[PDB]
Symmetry: C2
Subunit: 69 residues, 2 copies
């Protein structure tokens, strides 16, 4: 039905929100500290000196274990 | 259709996995450091001395901004 297409789109948008904002290929699993933006996979987070959301300096990267992983 | 029911269930299960493991009511937005388990809302994470998943000592709590929020 049309509701199947609407639900497929909601699922797609939610799955895309879980993907790294830089590479768009791997699941987000890393937090920039101290700002707390959690938007990258470990490989892109290792290569950024500034947060790509707020531009604050990255003092270190915290790995995050989420239940949805 | 039955396909619509299947997609509704996937969406529901994903949204339920995003809720605090202690209160089951608020969105997960906090990480226990250094272990990295990200399973609680701010209020439930604030008083735990040890991680509820792995029993490691909680040195501090890092707030996380998640794009799925
Ligand atoms: Zn990446
Ligand atoms: Zn930031
Ligand atoms: Zn809670
Ligand atoms: Zn832990």
């Amino acid at each position: 039905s049309q509701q199947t297409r609407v639900l497929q789109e909601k699922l797609r948008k939610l799955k895309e929100a879980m993907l790294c904002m830089v590479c768009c290929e791997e699941e987000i699993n890393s937090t920039f500290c101290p700002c707390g933006h959690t938007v990258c996979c470990e490989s892109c987070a290792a290569q950024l000196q500034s947060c790509p959301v707020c531009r604050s300096r990255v003092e270190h990267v915290q790995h995050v274990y989420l239940p949805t992983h």
